[PDB]
Structures are given as C-alpha cells and as structure tokens.
Amino acid sequence: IKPEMKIKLCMRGTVNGHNFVIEGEGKGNPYEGTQILDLNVTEGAPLPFAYDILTTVFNRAFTKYPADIQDYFKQTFPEGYHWERSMTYEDQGICTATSNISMRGDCFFYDIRFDGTNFPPNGPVMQKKTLKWEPSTEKMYVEDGVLKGDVNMRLLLEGGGHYRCDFKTTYKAKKEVRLPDAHKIDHRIEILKHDKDYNKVKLYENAVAR
Numbered sequence: 001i002k003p004e005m006k007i008k009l010c011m012r013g014t015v016n017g018h019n020f021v022i023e024g025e026g027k028g029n030p031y032e033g034t035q036i037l038d039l040n041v042t043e044g045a046p047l048p049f050a051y052d053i054l055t056t057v058f059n060r061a062f063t064k065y066p067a068d069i070q071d072y073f074k075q076t077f078p079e080g081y082h083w084e085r086s087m088t089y090e091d092q093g094i095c096t097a098t099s100n101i102s103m104r105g106d107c108f109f110y111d112i113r114f115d116g117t118n119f120p121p122n123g124p125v126m127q128k129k130t131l132k133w134e135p136s137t138e139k140m141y142v143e144d145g146v147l148k149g150d151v152n153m154r155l156l157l158e159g160g161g162h163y164r165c166d167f168k169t170t171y172k173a174k175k176e177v178r179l180p181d182a183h184k185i186d187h188r189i190e191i192l193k194h195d196k197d198y199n200k201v202k203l204y205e206n207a208v209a210r
Contacts, residue, residue, distance in 0.1 A: 001061070001074050002106050005030055007037055009058065009110035015095070016119050016126065020044030024058060026203075030074060033064035033208050036192070039201040046197035049119070050130040052155055055189055055203055057085070057097040057114055060149075060171065063185060063207040070180035071209075072147055072173070077103050079174035087153075088166045093119035124155075124163050131156045138167075138185040140209075147171045147179055151187075184210045 004027060011022040021043035028035025037058055041047060060083075065071040073081065080102040087095040095116035102109050119125045134154040141148050149169040154162045186208050193202040 001030055001077055003029060003031055004106070005061075006107035007035065007059070007110070008107060009037075009112055011054070011058065011110075011112040011114055013054075013112075013114035013116075015047075015049050015053070015114075015116035016121075018044060018048060020047060022054070022058075028062045030061050031064060033062055034206050035059075035062045035204070037203045039203060041197075041199045045199050048126070049116070050125045050128045050155075051191070051194070051198040051201060052130040052133060053087075053095060053116060053125060054114060055133065055191065056153075056167070056187075057099065057112060058203060059099075059101055059108060059110065060185070060207070061101070061108065062205065063209050065209045069183050069209050070178065072171070072177055072180045075177045076173040076175070081171060081173045083169055083171045085167060085169040089119075089125070090164045091120055091123050093117070093123065093125055124157050129158045130163070131158060132191070133187075133189050134162070135186065135188045138169075138187060139182075140180070140185060141182045142179050145179070149185070186210060 007026045009024045024037045024039040026037035060073040082100040085097045097114045100111040138149045138151040151167045153165040188206045190204045
C-alpha cells in the first residue's frame with residue numbers, strides 16, 4: 001500500500017429498472033484518507049436519477065487511521081476484500097450494493113454492482129432534488145465475527161430539507177485478518193465537478209478513523 005494509490009473501477013447497475021454502466025479512474029492517499037475519482041457513464045446515459053445515491057458506493061482503504069486503531073482495510077492487501085451494503089431510504093426506496101476490491105501494483109480495482117428499487121417516481125431521487133450528503137460518522141463494530149459499519153445518512157435537498165437513509169455495511173477480508181476494536185469514521189464526500197447530466201463527475205472523499 002503506497003502513499004499514493006491509483007483507482008480503477010466499473011459499476012454495473014439498475015435503478016427503478018433503468019440499466020447503466022459507469023467506469024471511473026482516479027488516485028488517492030490512503031494514509032491521508034483522501035481520494036479523487038473521475039467517473040464516466042458509459043451505458044444508460046443520461047441517468048434519470050440523483051447521482052448522490054451512487055457516490056458512497058464509488059474503499060475504506062482510503063482512511064487515515066491513528067497508530068493505535070487497528071487498520072483492518074489496509075491489512076487485507078495484497079489479496080483484497082469485498083463489502084456489502086443495504087441502503088434504506090426514509091421513503092422505502094431501497095438499494096443494495098456489492099464491491100469486490102483487489103490490487104495490482106500501485107492500483108486498486110473495484111468490481112461494483114448497484115441496484116435501486118421502489119423509489120417514488122415523484123420523490124427527490126427520481127426528480128433529482130438532492131444537493132449532497134451531510135458529513136457523517138460511521139460506527140464500526142463486530143458482530144458474530146464480521147466487521148460491520150452502521151451510519152445514519154442525510155442527503156440535503158433543494159430547499160434545505162433532508163432525506164434520510166440507513167446504511168448497513170459488511171466488510172470482509174479475502175484472507176482472514178484480525179478484527180479491529182470498535183471505533184468511528186468521520187466522512188465527508190463531495191461532488192467537486194460534474195457536467196450537465198452527470199455523465200462526467202469528479203468526486204472527493206475524506207475519511208478519518210477516531
């Protein structure tokens with residue numbers, strides 16, 4: 001795990017029945033907890049749904065970890081790890097995502113599946129009224145021997161309201177790795193730049209373990 005690492009991913013997905021493919025490439029500083037990704041829709045454009053629903057699915061390897069908090073994620077390499085996430089929105093829109101993360105030299109590779117079902121056609125997701133995720137805190141803990149992560153997420157809407165989502169995530173090393181103690185991860189995520197239909201998106205994350 002170098003101080004600078006490359007990223008390449010492919011996301012294959014469906015949302016309210018609409019198929020889509022998105023590729024990305026970027027770079028980040030795993031030990032500083034930061035990363036930039038450039039994302040390009042290559043199938044299914046123009047997305048007819050809020051792009052924010054995808055952003056946290058586009059690698060906890062990019063987290064700055066104190067010396068005294070066991071860094072599980074960096075330690076799953078070179079072999080890698082996979083995670084799984086359900087995302088339950090306050091309006092019964094539901095998405096699941098699975099990511100399989102591997103490594104070749106200085107580059108991570110993500111193989112990502114994303115599915116969203118039952119979004120109200122007049123809801124803020126299908127109408128694209130989302131502005132951004134609020135900074136958040138993921139609770140990392142262990143249950144029946146698996147590393148878990150829970151976070152109550154808030155998407156800010158046009159007009160200043162929030163639309164909540166409950167994230168539950170499971171993280172599993174390819175080759176057994178000693179589980180860390182409970183802790184927390186503070187997250188900020190931001191779309192730095194996008195074209196008109198979000199065909200091209202630059203996306204930034206900053207995450208620190210506490």
